[PDB]
Write a protein that binds this DNA or RNA. Sequence first.
DNA 1: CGTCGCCGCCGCGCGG
DNA 2: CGCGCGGCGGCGA
Length: 903
Amino acid sequence: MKEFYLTVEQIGDSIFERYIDSNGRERTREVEYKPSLFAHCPESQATKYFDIYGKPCTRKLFANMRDASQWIKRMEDIGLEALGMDDFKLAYLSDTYNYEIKYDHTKIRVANFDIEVTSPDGFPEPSQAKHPIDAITHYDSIDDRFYVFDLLNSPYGNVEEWSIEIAAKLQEQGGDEVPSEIIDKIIYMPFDNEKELLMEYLNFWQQKTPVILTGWNVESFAIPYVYNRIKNIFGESTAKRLSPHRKTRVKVIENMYGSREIITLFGISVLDYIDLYKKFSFTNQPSYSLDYISEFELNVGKLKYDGPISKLRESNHQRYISYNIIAVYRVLQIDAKRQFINLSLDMGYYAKIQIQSVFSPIKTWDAIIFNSLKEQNKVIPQGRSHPVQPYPGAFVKEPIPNRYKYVMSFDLTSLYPSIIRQVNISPETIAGTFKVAPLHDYINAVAERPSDVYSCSPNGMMYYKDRDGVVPTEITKVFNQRKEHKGYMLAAQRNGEIIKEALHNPNLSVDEPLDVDYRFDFSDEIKEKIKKLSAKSLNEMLFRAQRTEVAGMTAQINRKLLINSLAGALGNVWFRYYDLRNATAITTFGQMALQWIERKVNEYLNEVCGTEGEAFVLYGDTDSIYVSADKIIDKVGESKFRDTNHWVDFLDKFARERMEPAIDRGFREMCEYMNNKQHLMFMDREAIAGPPLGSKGIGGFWTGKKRYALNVWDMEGTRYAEPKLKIMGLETQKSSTPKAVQKALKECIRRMLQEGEESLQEYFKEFEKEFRQLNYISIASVSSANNIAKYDVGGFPGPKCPFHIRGILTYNRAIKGNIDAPQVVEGEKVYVLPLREGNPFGDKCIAWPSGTEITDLIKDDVLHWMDYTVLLEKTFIKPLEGFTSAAKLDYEKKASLFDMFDF
DNA sequence: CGTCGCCGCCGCGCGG
DNA sequence: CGCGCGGCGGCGA
Ligand SMILES: Nc1ccn([C@H]2C[C@H](O)[C@@H](COP(=O)(O)OP(=O)(O)OP(=O)(O)O)O2)c(=O)n1
Ligand SMILES: [Ca+2]
Ligand SMILES: [Ca+2]
Ligand SMILES: [Ca+2]
Ligand SMILES: [Ca+2]
Ligand SMILES: [Ca+2]
């Protein structure tokens, strides 16, 4: 096989590399790497090295890496550019793997661990590590085993050995319900004392050194606790055995709310799963405890136990160990579904970076662009210093607040990356500038043509047309990858709806699910067989369809994130290729393109309908337009349609056969006007929305910019078995809105769009009646706990104190001087509740850490002094009033002359 | 060390 | 709670 790296580090003048050799053996080597950097040289001296502008460069080969660094400093003192890759490990990887990396994940050691630390005096601070480590479960991906290190004797209690037999048993048999599929994979090791536990763990680690190290909060907790505890017991040299090169760095993260210290283990790539989840899941969660994320992702119930975790080991050691094993497995299960490790390894090897650098698109693109340029013997420019400067972004149209019955949306494929490709925006393709006219003059095609030679954006920039820049070239490759995976995702989605349809008529038999590839549209043979399957098999197929879909979603959306981050990076001062002319060229073009096509679409439909001045486009944001289809439906008449699916086919055909060709023509003209290199403005139909035929539903509504709801029947080719609510921006989509309120507001919207005014008033009335029975967590608001100290004036709210911060301070006073109580962590999330006047807490609100039941100390008083009326008004009624007034509805029945005839 | 646009809640200081 | 500005948090793109 072709060799690939595992990890790479620079230590002084050595490169330390772990890698997989041509036989699939893990190896390590130390190389005295001789780096090269570059200087501009006279036009009249032979060289094969040129900077990106075509200026000749001389290569300077250095005796060692320190010399190279010191030369960079001298070139600064002199005032001349030091060109080339100044991150020497990236240049090493590029020299060593001068080919597309083919990696074998089965040779990479992925380690997933969690630790337990009993602590009576509150949270066990990793930097202190003053409490014994009493459990480690370490899963190894190569052995496929859960190694459990269990401490039997501790100053906090002596316990009996854990029992795998009891752990396997159902909770109803008194067992711990450890999933049977891993029971055979557990290697259990009990220990008489902590010292031997840690010594054996270190020896284990040495034999089975993690390449990728993951888990839940391992970066902020497990890793530093283990490192510091070993350090405190044995000394630094022993702690440093966690690094395969015996080098660690104790270094803080420079934030704006305080400071926390993480431990950098040279020769390991730490991918804390929480950080992977936060960057790649496209969620914002009320809580980031593993219980909460597990239940969301997997639908598994919380781990239930009695008393505080600080007493769990001594009261129930059996469960303590089992829950530690289960926590590890749960991360693996989340990964089996989301596939973030896979994504990371894919991006990492593609860019040729340290795997942990996937968190940094700037580092990712810097390496991609450097490898691409190096292939042509080109030299990257030195990074420069820039002041942070604001710049303009996308265009958003002000919608007329209203209900909208029939709506077709259109959307541009990868807008910003397509603009980069269409215009040829790259650092080395800049050709000059033209005299800009006001934007609406380009929008309305009255401005003079920018250039007869170069490719332009309405911000004034011109670009070469003879050859593609490295930014367009490289953004295209990843764009193309994205498209493949999106194709897989959409097909899995369409396949899911076929299974849903079949579930309405399940057969009564014993059978198996079909062995099919869910990434491809089902054949007719597969479709027929599905129609003959039981509910059990169809459900299992649906589960697999939905899993295939999620896999495609991870792969496609994060590739989209990466390419959109390149466009963004152009506006970040730390990007080597930072240039505001280029960032603005993208965003201004976008503003033009959206408003241009609004004008064209209107002009087209006005002509089609025989009118003048009618606004068919009701809304637009960045790259999408929303078109009123009322008149189109009306031109044939509703009475001519058999059912909903009929008008949906009607609009699907109108959008694809009439609108898209006109939209294409409009953009082709814009490309010529701007003289662009390639026409890549592809606007396809996205959504078809409307009320169920024969119903009183309103179909959709907007309340303002970025706030709207639609009843969707078809979304980019997927015909739903059941209509789907597309809701953007409204309170149902916000993590800050109480769970029960999101649910209830959603049903109100469902009722408005699908059923009408009368059904809406039925639901509201009932919800207002029963509201007070709701569980307090389901009705608590959520917020982030930022800058608590800033607004803490001796335990009481300072000036301008935010509502949620007040709640935290109320909380802090109520738990004051209790070590056992959960502390609110700066920057983490809190549940928030209003309090009725005259409550013992002495303030109007209280906040506690999210994902948790509030400490038993104050729970009773919170539930008794909870202000339901305020709660109902603030989070439910006000947003609903917002929806209904925008939609011209009433949530409460207005009095009529019909009152009353019952007498 | 990917980006900007813009929403609603809140405290504040009005607003004769 | 009528009004706007600035802090904030958070979402849409
Ligand atoms: N995080 C993001 C998301 C969006 N945008 C910009 C770039 C996008 O091109 C444009 C529209 O975003 P979309 O959500 O519509 O997605 P794309 O058009 O990029 O891709 P696609 O529509 O094919 O999924 O907005 C951005 O700058 N940063
Ligand atoms: Ca735990
Ligand atoms: Ca788009
Ligand atoms: Ca699309
Ligand atoms: Ca059937
Ligand atoms: Ca869009």
